[PDB]
Design a binder for this molecule. Structure first.
Ligand SMILES: Cn1c(N)nc2ccccc21
Length: 282
């Protein structure tokens, strides 16, 4: 079926939970043996969220190459994304090592450091220009260059230096700051505006490594971001845009990371975002 009328048909029939459970039933199951080794217990935020072995990002280290991060490679859309958990106190150095080694331009953050009165990820970037961060385990230096605070999101320019080679690179930090503690946003307008800002920066484009996107676990809000982007790109590329099947795209992405889209409300919000976004594109 088309998207917008399939949408109204699920709303009128109140069957979002059944649609979402079908997706969960049909989703791929691949091994994640490296994530479950005992030496990696303190490298995982949640015991039921792990990268598959076949798609996990490997750190360029001989001691322990593990990080909780997956490469999502969308072949027809010609887009790639790295989805990862919010960094932990003992993995902030690993995080910036991955950004360096994979040649990423942008980092997309979809959570606040504290939500619901608890810490959802480490404070992994510097908050003042004159107070830079040094990660001694991975030999990197990170400096805040500028910050632009808007009503729904903040964009930061960062400098990442590899202290071993003295090479430097500019990283863009796109921080969506207004996703509600509970539930999903009522309108997709600010989320779409944010996606378009990431796009306009060049961070999603083939001349750079894959964008790094995270929330707390790296599957819920993160999944929404890449699902909406990929669906809108396919609607532009194809002769028949109504052929784009958001459930099929989601199942394809779930071949690369488990659990993408965590609730039926997130599923409905993804439909809403693609629907409204398709109108603005033209
Ligand atoms: C899961 N986890 C949390 N929540 N805090 C951590 C600190 C160190 C290592 C692991 C941690």
């Amino acid at each position: 079926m088309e998207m917008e009328k399939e949408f109204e048909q699920i709303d009128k029939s109140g069957s979002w939970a059944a649609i979402y459970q079908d997706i969960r039933h049909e989703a791929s199951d691949f091994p994640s043996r490296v994530a479950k080794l005992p030496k990696n217990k303190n490298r995982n935020r949640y015991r039921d969220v792990s990268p598959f072995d076949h798609s996990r990002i490997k750190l360029h280290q001989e001691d322990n190459d593990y990080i909780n991060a997956s490469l999502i490679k969308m072949e027809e859309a010609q887009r790639s994304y790295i989805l990862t958990q919010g960094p932990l106190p003992n993995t902030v150095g690993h995080f910036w090592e991955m950004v360096w080694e994979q040649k990423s331009r942008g980092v997309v953050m979809l959570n606040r450091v504290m939500e619901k009165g608890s810490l959802k990820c480490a404070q992994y970037w510097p908050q003042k220009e004159e107070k830079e961060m040094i990660f001694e385990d991975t030999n990197l230096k990170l400096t805040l260059i500028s910050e632009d605070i808007k009503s729904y999101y903040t964009v930061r320019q960062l400098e990442l230096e590899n202290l071993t080679t003295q090479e430097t690179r500019e990283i863009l930090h796109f921080h969506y700051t207004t996703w509600p503690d509970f539930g999903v946003p009522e309108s997709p307008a600010s989320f779409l505006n944010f996606l378009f800002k990431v796009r306009e920066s060049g961070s999603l484009s083939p001349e750079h490594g894959p964008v790094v996107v995270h929330c707390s676990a790296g599957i819920g809000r993160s999944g929404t971001f890449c699902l909406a982007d990929t669906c809108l790109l396919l609607m532009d590329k194809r002769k028949d845009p109504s052929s784009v099947d958001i459930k099929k795209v989601l199942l394809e992405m779930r071949k690369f990371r488990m659990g993408l889209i965590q609730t039926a409300d997130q599923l409905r919000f993804s439909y809403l975002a693609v629907i409204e976004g398709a109108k603005f594109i033209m």
